[PDB]
């Protein structure tokens, strides 16, 4: 795998808005959201919880629609 993907830094509770601190980007196998679009899903709320090291995949984040 070449291109980073956004990965939980923290365990992220269901119904939370994400914020910065919340979202590393790294690349993992299968892909998620691409990690440029990080600034796109600040104050977006997960949908589920997001145990730490999860990749953030477009099903788990509410309103999420590129």
Same mark, same amino acid.
């Given at each position: 795998?070449?291109?980073?993907? +956004? %990965?939980?830094?923290?365990?992220? &509770?269901?119904? /939370? *808005?994400? /914020?910065? +601190?919340? !979202?590393? *980007?790294? +690349? #993992?196998? &299968?892909?998620?959201?691409?990690? #440029? =679009?990080?600034?796109?899903? +600040? ?6 919880? %997001?145990?730490?090291? /999860?990749?953030?995949?477009? =099903? !788990? #984040?509410?309103?999420?629609? &590129?």
């Amino acid at each position: 795998m070449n291109q980073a993907s +956004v %990965v939980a830094n923290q365990l992220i &509770p269901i119904n /939370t *808005a994400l /914020t910065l +601190v919340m !979202m590393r *980007a790294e +690349v #993992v196998t &299968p892909m998620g959201i691409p990690a #440029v =679009d990080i600034p796109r899903l +600040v104050s977006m709320q997960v949908n589920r919880a %997001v145990p730490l090291g /999860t990749t953030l995949m477009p =099903d !788990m #984040v509410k309103g999420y629609a &590129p």
